[PDB]
Design an enzyme around this catalytic site. Structure first.
Site, PDB file in Angstrom:
ATOM      1  N   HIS A  41       0.957  -1.405  -0.081  1.00 32.68           N
ATOM      2  CA  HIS A  41      -0.134  -0.229  -0.129  1.00 32.68           C
ATOM      3  C   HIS A  41       0.848   1.361   0.017  1.00 32.68           C
ATOM      4  O   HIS A  41       0.691   2.348   0.058  1.00 32.68           O
ATOM      5  CB  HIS A  41      -1.078   0.364   0.998  1.00 32.68           C
ATOM      6  CG  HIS A  41      -0.773  -0.011   2.761  1.00 32.68           C
ATOM      7  ND1 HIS A  41       0.100   1.568   2.817  1.00 32.68           N
ATOM      8  CD2 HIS A  41      -0.045  -0.592   3.668  1.00 32.68           C
ATOM      9  CE1 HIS A  41       0.021   1.066   4.299  1.00 32.68           C
ATOM     10  NE2 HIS A  41       0.284   0.179   4.572  1.00 32.68           N
ATOM     11  N   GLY A 143       2.097   6.242  10.180  1.00 33.03           N
ATOM     12  CA  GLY A 143       3.986   6.122   9.790  1.00 33.03           C
ATOM     13  C   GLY A 143       4.336   4.449  10.395  1.00 33.03           C
ATOM     14  O   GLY A 143       5.725   4.337  10.322  1.00 33.03           O
ATOM     15  N   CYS A 145       3.765   2.027   9.939  1.00 32.93           N
ATOM     16  CA  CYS A 145       3.109   0.527   8.819  1.00 32.93           C
ATOM     17  C   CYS A 145       4.890   0.151   9.190  1.00 32.93           C
ATOM     18  O   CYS A 145       5.170   0.138   7.282  1.00 32.93           O
ATOM     19  CB  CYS A 145       2.670   1.343   7.832  1.00 32.93           C
ATOM     20  SG  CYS A 145       1.030   1.381   8.533  1.00 32.93           S
TER      21      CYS A 145
END
Ligand SMILES: CNC(=O)C1(N2C[C@@H](C(=O)Nc3cncc4ccccc34)c3cc(Cl)ccc3C2=O)CC1
Ligand SMILES: CNC(=O)C1(N2C[C@@H](C(=O)Nc3cncc4ccccc34)c3cc(Cl)ccc3C2=O)CC1
Ligand SMILES: [Cl-]
Lengths: 305, 305
Positions: A41, A143, A145
């Protein structure tokens, strides 16, 4: 003495954390050999995240569209591919700090350490378990991820989790290092909810054995129970069913303390029906389920890495 | 979202852990530059431990009496000195993995990460606080002596604790990195006991503010309190006195949530009175005191839910 929630030393993993940027999105990546692994993503804008055709979004991208940063050095992306929900960026330089590693898929109830990162910089480490509903009650902000979950065997780092998203109840969802999600989740900004959670019975039992080792026996009774009768009570308190495999795994702890597994199950049966009555076990007023039988044995033996 | 007990990434500290042997004793050492720091009781036998004369024991030692091991490499000791309860061994090789560091002495209520080691090998990491009675409720076994507590704030590792001994109640005692003990303890196997412990009030308040930030307000009430009236109630529940310094420190959290410190103090007064009534705050059935106001600002978001 002392029983704490303990994570593995994060050093072998810290040397793998890089920052990955594609357009406006910035998240974390795992740099192993000449490949950087990150959530797919990263190629999605806030417009794309709604109904994203990832192959269509990726085919438009070139290597130079991905900015990879390792500390203060920029890495040159020379190739890109997708494996399930993970994006694999082939970089110019092999990571000199690459440890001995494996990609393993963990099961619900199994624990792991999380190295929480922001902008490719590790900020913290914490231990947690894969819930039976496949979510992790982690601690993540925007942030985070691309933050990873891992275990250590000897010198081998077993990567088992990559962070993808936070659910509306504040719990977390991610994939194994092969991009396959844990649970019925998809990597999209859509309405998704965690299923009803259950208590990891084999882990609570292990934590009761750990309390006996630390001199906490107030909950022990003279009673025993059959495996079938314990499961009928457990199913009523939203506890995971205890299997014969679970009983066998608790064997060494039962042998070390002198309390048979079904004897310790009759103590858990009584704690579920009557409560703690103002008392605590290992400083807790709740029955703890994020310590596996192996975690208890490792912390009460002194296994090093 | 999510609030976990979080330790600092242990990597910068793992690269400093060495194994120190003097005769039959084997414990851990911290290798920074060309000096290895370890508890001075490494020169002691179990016979010496009752009433040891350390200056008399050290004058009888030479450099080659100390075997220092870094991974698989042996370090050559070229000098030795004693600073309070720490033994400083000057070695022939400067540690190439030496991070940016500082030796800081902390006050009770301050938190830190512990890298638990056995034979110079880090086995685990956990977060904990310096109790008001100067002990730490750690998780240590025999051979853990010389394990260190630290905080990594920005790019600097602040060493604040070195493990020395376990007390009869299972709690732990150690020194700052200058060999000065925390608390009224001595490195003697004598009848010494930890003082009665108290709850770190400023930390519980910070943790209540963290719960409000994560969208939980069930515990808030329409009452406020004077500082003196809160302390009279707090003393009765074995809580540390809340000082004006503590109130000032909670200022940013009070400003961010819109709940004045003395209003949050009234909620705490009621929480002690009523208990939780089957409810939890940040997934806990007890009032948590091992998160400082600084930890909460570091871990939680800047936007309240
Ligand atoms: C709650 N987050 C959101 O509302 C947003 N979101 C972003 C992202 C995601 O969840 N990121 C986070 C991950 N861990 C902790 C977070 C804490 C606070 C915000 C975001 C966090 C995400 C990823 C994927 Cl695969 C699918 C959907 C989303 C997504 O919806 C922002 C819109
Ligand atoms: C609990 N203590 C002990 O059984 C004994 N002991 C040894 C040593 C010490 O405490 N070592 C440990 C340190 N951390 C965790 C320990 C856990 C289990 C055993 C030992 C541990 C020590 C050192 C010093 Cl400076 C002063 C006193 C002692 C001391 O009393 C043996 C008597
Ligand atoms: Cl301090």
């Amino acid at each position: 003495s002392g029983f704490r929630k303990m994570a593995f030393p994060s050093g072998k993993v810290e040397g793998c954390m890089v920052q990955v940027t594609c357009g406006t999105t910035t998240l974390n990546g795992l740099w192993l050999d000449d490949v950087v692994y990150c959530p797919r993503h990263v190629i999605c804008t806030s417009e794309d995240m709604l109904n994203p055709n990832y192959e269509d979004l990726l085919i438009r991208k070139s290597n130079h569209n991905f900015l990879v940063q390792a500390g203060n050095v920029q890495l040159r992306v020379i190739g890109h591919s997708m494996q399930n929900c993970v994006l694999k960026l082939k970089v110019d330089t092999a990571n000199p700090k690459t440890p001995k590693y494996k990609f393993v898929r963990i099961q619900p109830g199994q624990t792991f350490s999380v190295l929480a990162c922001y902008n490719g910089s590790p900020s913290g480490v914490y231990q947690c378990a894969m819930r039976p509903n496949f979510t992790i009650k982690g601690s993540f902000l925007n942030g985070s991820c691309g933050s990873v979950g891992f275990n250590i065997d000897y010198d081998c780092v077993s990567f088992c989790y990559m962070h993808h998203m936070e659910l509306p109840t504040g719990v977390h969802a991610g994939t194994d290092l092969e991009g396959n999600f844990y649970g019925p989740f998809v990597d999209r900004q859509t309405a998704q909810a965690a299923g009803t959670d259950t208590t990891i019975t084999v882990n609570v039992l292990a934590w009761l054995y750990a309390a006996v080792i630390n001199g906490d026996r107030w909950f022990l009774n003279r009673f025993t129970t059959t495996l079938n009768d314990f499961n009928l009570v457990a199913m009523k308190y939203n506890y995971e069913p205890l299997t014969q495999d679970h009983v066998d795994i608790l064997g060494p702890l039962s042998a070390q303390t002198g309390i048979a597994v079904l004897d310790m199950c009759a103590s858990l049966k009584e704690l579920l029906q009557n409560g703690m009555n103002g008392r605590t076990i290992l400083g807790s007023a709740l029955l703890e389920d994020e310590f596996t039988p192996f975690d208890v044995v490792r912390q009460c033996s002194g296994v090093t890495f």
